[PDB]
């Protein structure tokens, strides 16, 4: 089945997609449509997954996530770890909709939060990104202008979710995508 890569513009979805499929680097520009290709997993049986790279632009992100969500075995939400500090709110807001969409599904897809661009010095760790995102989703479920996140009476945390949710670190620039290929293998 399909693995959807989603995230804000410039989080690195297309470059990861390329790195996973060719092991190489390639110049890219902002994506305006989705792209897909078959990925042969690293494990013995070598199962095949269909990677689908979804544009992060606001005008297209939901239209396309809606179109492909029911076909998803897994969702990889990509995060620019170096720009995280200034983009936190935009990230949390998009992830919120991704969490909701995912839970409202018959067979909830497994979900990964790939903290990308680790090769850049100022990059926040996956541990710190998880912490700040929980704190932020915690405010959003109250301010957000019926499926809901965790329990209303307790501070939000990803573990309270009826979904498999993992965090890992990576870099698309060869690259450092070992953990990501491990996880992809594991969910195939």
């Amino acid at each position: 089945r399909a693995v959807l890569f989603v995230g804000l513009c410039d989080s690195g979805k297309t470059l990861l997609f390329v790195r996973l499929l060719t092991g190489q680097y390639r110049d890219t520009q902002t994506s305006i449509t989705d792209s897909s290709a078959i990925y042969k997993v690293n494990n013995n049986r070598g199962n095949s997954l269909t990677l689908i790279d979804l544009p992060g632009h606001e005008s297209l992100r939901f239209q396309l996530l809606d179109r492909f969500k029911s076909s998803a075995r897994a969702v990889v939400f990509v995060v620019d770890s170096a720009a995280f500090q200034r983009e936190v709110k935009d990230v949390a807001e998009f992830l919120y909709q991704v969490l909701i969409d995912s839970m409202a599904l018959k067979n909830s897809p497994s979900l990964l939060i790939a903290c990308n661009k680790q090769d850049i010095a100022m990059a926040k760790s996956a541990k710190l990104i998880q912490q700040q995102l929980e704190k932020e989703l915690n405010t959003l479920r109250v301010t957000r202008s019926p499926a809901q996140l965790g329990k209303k009476g307790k501070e939000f945390e990803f573990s309270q979710l009826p979904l498999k949710v993992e965090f890992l670190e990576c870099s698309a620039k060869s690259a450092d995508i070992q953990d990501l290929e491990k996880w992809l293998a594991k969910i195939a």
Binding site: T14, L21, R26, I32, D34, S35, A37
Partner: protein, 124 residues
């Protein structure tokens, strides 16, 4: 001077397939193209950046050029480049899988210089 100072062809998926930026270098961006083609070559000229789409095979052609009034010649260069590119590489681009673009070699430089050198004669 040159009819175009910048030219890049990428898929709508965001994959750059080929780009030109002088017989001098290999595309470092429109800004450097404006610095090298205009600033270091003399109101002064600006660089107009326009695009053309191929919706059937999901391609975007972006060109940067000087002198807004040469737009007709630039537009013809784009059309000729488009027609040739889509024929020479139809196999790599009609496929759905991105691997098809990822594994193709788009060595278009020579066919492009020819079309450029050729379009700069139609202008005269």
């Amino acid at each position: 001077h040159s009819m175009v100072d910048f030219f890049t062809i990428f898929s709508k998926g965001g994959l750059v397939l080929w780009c030109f930026q002088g017989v001098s270098d290999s595309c470092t961006g429109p800004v450097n193209a404006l610095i090298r083609s205009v600033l270091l070559q003399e109101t002064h000229e600006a660089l107009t950046l326009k695009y053309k789409l191929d919706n059937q095979f999901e391609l975007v052609f972006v060109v940067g050029f000087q002198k807004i009034l040469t737009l007709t010649y630039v537009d013809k260069l784009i059309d000729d480049v488009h027609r040739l590119f889509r024929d020479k590489y139809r196999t790599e681009i009609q496929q759905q899988s991105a691997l098809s673009l990822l594994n193709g070699t788009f060595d278009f430089q020579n066919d492009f210089l020819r079309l450029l050198r050729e379009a700069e004669e139609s202008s005269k």
